[PDB]
């Protein structure tokens with residue numbers, strides 16, 4: 001499917017970005033105790049990859065929602081001057097640029 005091919009490319013490019021390291025896998029309780037009592041809807045790029053392979057992203061408004069949740073979770077949990085917050089904004093920019101290059105639209 002062409003939609004699948006585009007999203008996989010976009011996601012793979014996001015996963016390769018230098019600023020994607022805080023979001024590759026789910027937050028661990030060891031890394032942030034009590035995280036999962038504040039962030040009701042966790043999301044990460046591994047979870048997104050599996051969701052892509054399982055064919056859950058039948059639309060753009062969907063792939064966007066999951067990836068945006070990653071950023072909003074980080075901005076809600078962390079302060080603006082932490083490296084996690086900084087990484088979210090850098091990666092968000094890159095993401096939106098990649099969305100434009102592909103002309104991905106609803």
Ligand SMILES: CN1CCC[C@@H](Nc2nc3cc[nH]c3c(=O)n2C)C1
Nearest residue numbers: 022023025026027028031032074084
């Ligand atoms: C799998 N692990 C590897 C290590 C980094 C972790 N991601 C992460 N950790 C902390 C700690 C405080 N705030 C955050 C945060 O916002 N994030 C996204 C994911």
